[PDB]
Point group: D2
Chain length 499, copies 4
């Protein structure tokens, strides 16, 4: 099959306490290629005991200090060498990801560029701020705040952008001096396995980094609830996130949650019309709409609603579907039969509550798409804010279209959801765009663009799209804890109690 | 009775959406003075629907923008007007707090001075950091982060220092423009009711501040679990904390937890001895040990242990118990019969597992204390880290004493608990105190001192003593949320999808 | 006037080392009211030995540490007391400023409000940052940066906005713990004398604050050149600033300079026309253009140029000149015969090089303005960037009008001067306003507004408009110096040199 | 000996992307201080070459190819220079030792530091664009954007040519400024090399420029030209005063890093052997030609005599020789003029009643006669009123003074026009900290001497300078703030009659 050579030397095992090792029970898992449903690889399926052992090794390593007591400058140099290795093997990593997740090759190349930059950013931030000096309000005292690594941290990622979500958590952890245990989505472990071999070549002490492979239903709880864990950085669906928070509570453990969204793409009548159409398509269908920042909820002003529906619909009929390795492919398949069915059930929900499937809504007929997990890019019209298809995250190549009369009605509709991750506003009137952006309860607002995000700036949600932040200085602040040391430079007896 | 004048004009009601109102079911509760167990006041015992009403009132107010959109400079002027009212009524407040909680009048004066200072600090911080500008990695884009108020916030406090703990939550909330709903310990609401009366006089838009009165076992779940709350700031026991975090997870709601501690007080043989004895007494018996920062776990170096034990014990026999208002009084009563019962049960625990009650460990015998909730300052010896009396937070006028041979052993013991709030180190060798300070997993560390904490510096725990911080800039950030606004100054079509 | 009452209790003396004292040689100076040219007051004219003595007192005090070593919190409380003194006495101060400088009362009330806010802003910034903790690249070392008060600072202000300019220097100086010696313009000392009376009431240690009254030509070289001066903060004309810098080099003394401006006011054809005219007038004739932030150089797009000129000209004819105390007055007189003379000489220079005096250009003939130092609001047309009238600062009620075709041309002209203090831009296309603002070499840029400046943000020049900043956090940093204290926690011999 | 390095080294200046000769074809011979022999010949630039350089910097800066490049990319480029320093570590270190005469091990320390300086600023490039202010005016957005200052001129001394050059180049490039640099006329070698290296990395035409020449011929143009936005100068105080004065003609910002009279304070409760070791190190590394040298030793009276005895006895054993020999502990001083300047101070010291306890002259040994060597010296029986104690000698010389108490030590240490760096030795850390706080110095070392790194700012209090180098503060010298205030609901004032 295609991509076969990339897998010839990849590890099938987990990585615990400095060694590549199997599952405690030698159980394994088959890895699927959503383009043809062929098994392409077989990796270990760790037990909860393996996860426990990894966590304990992380703690043991953290306490020894080899990495936590290493200078911030040096840690930065090592995070920077990881970055150099991403770029060195950019070609192989990009394919590996396309093969595992199904997105076009061009999309996977874009990630290796971001990933390189993500580690590169944190490598440079490592030695830039160790805390602060406070002007004490008590005479003859010195007051200071030192920032230390939180300790041991568990990192859990989703299947849509595996190595990308991994790097967002890995970079700051290592930059701060923490020891980490990571578990990628059970269905997309390929690139995460590669990066560990890469980090291993860079050289880290035994137990600083550990990789667990397995179902979240079996090892997850261990990772969110073990008492030696100080931080749990999770990226995934909301329900799994609530589970995690409640279990983390058993030992009052900090969390950082990066959940889903119902991201609005607000289009005013004075917008660059062809740009708005270009970006609606992009927002709704890159990686088959399996993107947490996908613009699945299009809000379009009534004056141009009709025209907008026609243009969008006509462009969607031309979207090329195929293998990610094919140069023509604009949109790939969805990740699994489970996920595909999930999306299919949403078409029945929509139809049954009053919405119109304007186009798509089914599997591709074609002779060259029948064997893959493809689903037609779709547009839903005649829907409103009370419908489940509009309120809930479908996480597929689906978008809804709602109209608004005014600027107030646009904000009202965009903020009318449990989520608050990201969104955009298209308009040539920047004063109006800036007004709107200020009233939107979103972690990230794009004015006349859709998708841009980078290490220099924090990413995360308002409301139920999350807790905490990733990337930028705040992304780093998650892996740090503050200690206030107050010295009394002229101690004196208080003499409150009798003598 | 002694403090009658203080209550002849005090309100007995809840404060919701600009009005002083009773409970939904006219239910009420009696508040007592722990020095004599006399009922001194009757207030409303509100319901969960009242709580829901407050939360909704705070939500409306926040969305109207009357406080949330007020300039940060003006918000700061009003927080400063509150600080001014604390100082203006300083006398009456300290007396009120002492009447309700039993602590000495001098301690209550100290609180009032800190409360003024807290509001003043945050009044002063309101307008200094609106967020940042990012040098964007994408040409022709403007990247910026704006810091916004988090929204509606619920604030829950303990009975030990009611107003002090309330100030730490109210000040930053207002400073940032959030709407708040507060509920103090059901047994100590007097000073909290008072400060609401004073914040009313300062002047705030309807629904911006709200006071709920009632048992947390009845109205607490609403304040932690309602979908409209954006943050729950909690200061109390660990189990209530875990219960709250699990509940807040139902709507992925931010939590800030300030829990208890098992604070070590380390005393080296090269420490100023009379200084150590003085601060060990203060650390152990201020407010009868009903203090989250109490130095309940004394670690003394073996070469001076016997000498230390007898001095400490000799001084404990001389501690003057009595009424808070009386100047000669050095230690007051404990808060309730339930809490004294809990402390009595710990003496039996200590004895059952092999420890020695070297002094105290019972009710005082004197005739004038017979009616109050007094319990003798106690010193427990011949104990170790495997015992419950050493591990668990007694929160009474009780300290345990353990020995250590070396520097490595003092630290090991100090970190051998699930907590990590605060601690102290006593030694004339400042290099050594600093080494030790750095390995101590505590939020705050005192070198040759015990207790100092002020608005200028963050406070909170490592491990299970908490999540997040109060005071300082970190404290302010719990009430703020970051939004990244990216503008494409030269938007261009991507043309990924076929035309 | 009703304002001669303001003066019956005002000090006529200098303030040195805690005492109100006369000149060393008892010399005096007569102060003038520009509306009628009458001598309203008489004060001490200090000698160069009085200045030397003031600086020596400020040094003595700084070293004793009564103020420099006081807590930052307490310093902030005092700066806050001064701010309250400004508000209490707002009325009297505003009248006094109008009496002394000729501007309207409405303008002086505005200054007093700003002034209050300046002291308040800095009171609150005082205790917010004492330095940083650095993560050292050398093992077994601690690295911290402490911010200290820079020491003794001399402060020199201009005659246009005496107290305002003084507030900008005093506030951070006292907040950071420095010692200051101030000298206001010799012709406008009234408000400055008053504010020293007020600062004395709040109470500061002897030496901390010092007031010298006198001609810069006599005592200025001592304030810039004495070796005990650590910083020299000057606000005045460019030629005096150059002289000062050169003098400060004798002892490598730090400098902060706020010089003049040739501030452009850019008006695109897509601007709100009536807003543009309103603002062009305001920027042009507030305080008879005797403003360092005055929009003297109007740049207007060609397509609306004729229409704009005519519109501006018609409005200028109606400007009402008179007494600053009369409510009908829109623009008062200029400061002195000398200053008026300078402006007049500028009308000749303009004419001889080919510009047109489209309106104004002379003293008003009117009967009630006859005895005053008035000068008609003027508009100069048919001018270009090579002309002196356009390149140089007139500092009068005069503006030059120049056309531009494109966006690049406006940017090129706006930036074609030796200056770079401030500027504005008017256009309904906010996108375009941002592009322009980015390319203007100016410390402050206004989009659709003119004159806004406040304590929360830094003010100062680019190019020859100055060195350093005033206001905001950067304003405070002028009064601080950094110290890297590096401690070696495990000192070891190097053994480079033989035994 | 180290002939091989120079074989392919450029002899010319670098202006507007071309390696070019002086306008008047003039040249200058470079010397190896160990043997006073001519090792290389370079161009002697004119002041018009300097004016041409500056005008090129201005053009490039305005064209925006570097000033408007993303901060992230600029950072990657600074990192590429960092890497070339490591790549050529060996050569550069031999080259610095050949030109300046210090030991090879010192030159290695420099290159490691130089790598880390570039690396640090490469990492700081994109971390802070400015800030959002909470405007007190309703319906207004307020933001402070940080922009590159403009054209910057950079001038360095002969003691640590490349080290001092790196402290200026790194932040300039990182922020997007354009530059024109001039090294000391006698030590231009490694600076010419670092330019050949920067050229291989790639920067647009005009961004970086190198002028070669005497400060008394081209220096005024670099401090006084009106197109210059900032003057970053590291050198002597007197030159410092001159430059500031000239820079004032166009109100041009300046950063000054000047000399010091750094105190090395030793209390009786210090680790005695640790204090003797570090006193030798602070006084004689690079033959005391270090801006951070501990030339003013202050020792508590109770151990003063003991310390003098020990120090002197150790100074007598200091190995003098060729910087290329592993045995050499101290090399020669830089030039004939600098050695005579030090000799004249010996006369001054003896004339004012001080004692030359040991050293104070050239060494006679046959193999050291052809080099610019001067014996490590120790001057006793002196006081704060004397010149030997108040002025920067910059030779291998120390002065020893006694102090009875903590206050007297503090008083003497601050009793100079300077305030750059200093040390405090004592096992009592509490005491070291009270002292550190009261010393008016840019950097204070507790129980150590010399540490300084990119992570923390370096500069002086009092007359040791204006501004800072290194750390975030050193970057801020190359940036200027712009307050952009937008009114989002403008309304007419209607002050003036319609
Ligand atoms: N906020 C963001 O930055 C962001 C980015 C990408 C994706 N997402 C979201 O992530 C989701 C991706 O889908 P997914 O199916 O991978 O998410 P998921 O919630 O199904 O699972 C994600 C990860 O959690 C693990 N897991 C499952 N149960 C667990 C448990 N009890 N304890 C611990 N771990 C457990 C899974 O094995 C997997 O590794 C989408 O909703 C998308 O919106 C968010």
């Amino acid at each position: 099959f295609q991509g076969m050579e990339l897998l010839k030397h990849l590890s099938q095992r987990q990585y615990i306490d400095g060694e590549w090792v199997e599952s405690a029970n030698k159980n394994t898992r088959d890895i699927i290629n959503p383009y043809n449903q062929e098994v392409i690889f077989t990796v270990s399926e760790g037990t909860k005991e393996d996860a426990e052992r990894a966590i304990l090794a992380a703690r043991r390593a953290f306490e020894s200090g080899e990495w936590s007591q290493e200078t911030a400058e040096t840690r930065g140099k090592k995070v920077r060498a990881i970055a150099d290795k991403i770029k060195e093997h950019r070609e192989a990593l990009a394919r590996l990801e396309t093969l595992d997740t199904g997105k076009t090759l061009e999309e996977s190349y874009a990630d290796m560029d971001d990933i390189h930059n993500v580690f590169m950013y944190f490598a440079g931030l490592a030695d830039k701020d160790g805390g602060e000096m406070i002007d004490s309000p008590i005479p003859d005292t010195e007051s200071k705040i030192v920032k230390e690594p939180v300790g041991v941290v568990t990192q859990i990622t989703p299947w849509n952008y595996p190595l990308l979500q991994a790097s967002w958590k890995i970079a700051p952890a290592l930059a701060t001096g923490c020891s980490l245990v990571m578990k990628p989505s059970e269905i997309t472990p390929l690139t995460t396995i590669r990066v560990f071999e890469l980090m291993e070549e860079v050289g880290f002490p035994k137990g600083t980094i550990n990789l667990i492979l397995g179902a979240g239903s079996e090892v997850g709880d261990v990772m969110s609830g073990h008492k030696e864990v100080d931080l749990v950085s999770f990226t995934g669906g909301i329900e799994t996130g609530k589970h995690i928070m409640k279990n983390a509570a058993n030992n009052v453990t900090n969390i950082a949650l990066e959940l889903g969204g119902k991201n609005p793409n607000i289009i005013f009548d004075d917008a660059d019309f062809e740009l708005a159409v270009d970006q609606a398509l992009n927002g709704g269908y890159f990686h088959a709409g399996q993107v947490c920042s996908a613009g699945s909820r299009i809000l379009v002003q009534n004056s141009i609603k009709d025209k907008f529906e026609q243009a969008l619909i006509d462009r969607v009929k031309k979207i090329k579907l195929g293998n990610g390795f094919d140069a023509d492919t604009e949109m790939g398949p969805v990740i699994s039969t489970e996920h595909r069915n999930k999306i299919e059930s949403y078409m029945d929900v929509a139809k049954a509550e009053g919405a119109t499937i304007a186009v798509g809504g089914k599997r591709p007929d074609r002779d060259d798409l029948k064997d893959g997990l493809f689903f037609e890019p779709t547009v839903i019209t005649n829907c409103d804010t009370s419908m489940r298809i509009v309120q809930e995250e479908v996480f597929g190549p689906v978008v809804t279209v709602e109209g608004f009369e005014t600027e107030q009605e646009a904000i009202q509709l965009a903020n009318d959801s449990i989520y608050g991750l990201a969104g955009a506003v298209f308009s040539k009137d920047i004063g109006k765009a800036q007004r709107v952006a200020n009233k939107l309860k979103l972690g990230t607002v794009w004015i006349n663009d859709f998708f841009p995000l980078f290490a220099q700036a924090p990413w995360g949600g308002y409301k139920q799209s999350g807790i905490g932040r990733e990337l930028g200085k705040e992304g780093l602040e998650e892996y740090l804890v503050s200690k206030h040391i107050l010295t009394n430079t002229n101690p004196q007896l208080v003499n409150w109690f009798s003598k």
